[PDB]
Design a binder for this molecule. Structure first.
Ligand SMILES: [Cl-]
Ligand SMILES: [Zn+2]
Lengths: 28, 21
Protein backbone atom coordinates (compact mmCIF):
# COMPACT_ATOMS: atom_id res chain seq x y z
CA UNK A 1 0.00 0.00 0.00
CA UNK A 2 2.43 2.64 -1.34
CA UNK A 3 0.17 5.04 -3.25
CA UNK A 4 3.13 6.42 -5.08
CA UNK A 5 4.32 3.08 -6.46
CA UNK A 6 0.64 2.10 -6.90
CA UNK A 7 -0.23 5.47 -8.53
CA UNK A 8 2.33 4.86 -11.34
CA UNK A 9 0.61 1.54 -12.14
CA UNK A 10 -2.80 3.25 -12.14
CA UNK A 11 -1.77 6.09 -14.56
CA UNK A 12 -0.47 3.43 -16.90
CA UNK A 13 -3.70 1.33 -16.72
CA UNK A 14 -5.87 4.48 -17.19
CA UNK A 15 -3.84 5.31 -20.29
CA UNK A 16 -4.76 1.79 -21.75
CA UNK A 17 -8.42 1.69 -20.63
CA UNK A 18 -9.26 5.29 -21.47
CA UNK A 19 -7.20 5.37 -24.64
CA UNK A 20 -8.37 8.25 -26.84
CA UNK A 21 -10.89 9.76 -24.31
CA UNK A 22 -8.07 10.66 -21.88
CA UNK A 23 -8.32 11.24 -18.13
CA UNK A 24 -7.41 13.58 -15.28
CA UNK A 25 -5.12 12.20 -12.58
CA UNK A 26 -5.51 14.09 -9.32
CA UNK A 27 -3.51 12.47 -6.52
CA UNK A 28 -7.06 13.72 -4.31
CA UNK B 1 -10.77 8.28 -4.59
CA UNK B 2 -9.18 5.88 -7.13
CA UNK B 3 -6.07 5.58 -4.98
CA UNK B 4 -8.35 4.60 -2.08
CA UNK B 5 -10.50 2.26 -4.19
CA UNK B 6 -7.87 0.78 -6.56
CA UNK B 7 -4.73 0.43 -4.36
CA UNK B 8 -6.13 -1.55 -1.37
CA UNK B 9 -8.11 -3.75 -3.71
CA UNK B 10 -7.80 -4.53 -7.41
CA UNK B 11 -10.02 -2.63 -9.80
CA UNK B 12 -11.05 -4.32 -13.04
CA UNK B 13 -11.06 -2.57 -16.47
CA UNK B 14 -14.79 -2.07 -15.82
CA UNK B 15 -14.20 -0.15 -12.57
CA UNK B 16 -11.29 1.81 -14.06
CA UNK B 17 -13.40 3.06 -17.03
CA UNK B 18 -15.29 5.16 -14.46
CA UNK B 19 -12.22 7.52 -14.25
CA UNK B 20 -12.00 8.12 -18.00
CA UNK B 21 -12.91 11.44 -19.60
CL1 LIG C 1 5.15 -1.71 -7.13
ZN1 LIG D 1 5.50 -1.31 -9.31
Amino acid sequence: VNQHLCGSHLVEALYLVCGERGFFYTPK
Amino acid sequence: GIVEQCCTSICSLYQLENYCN
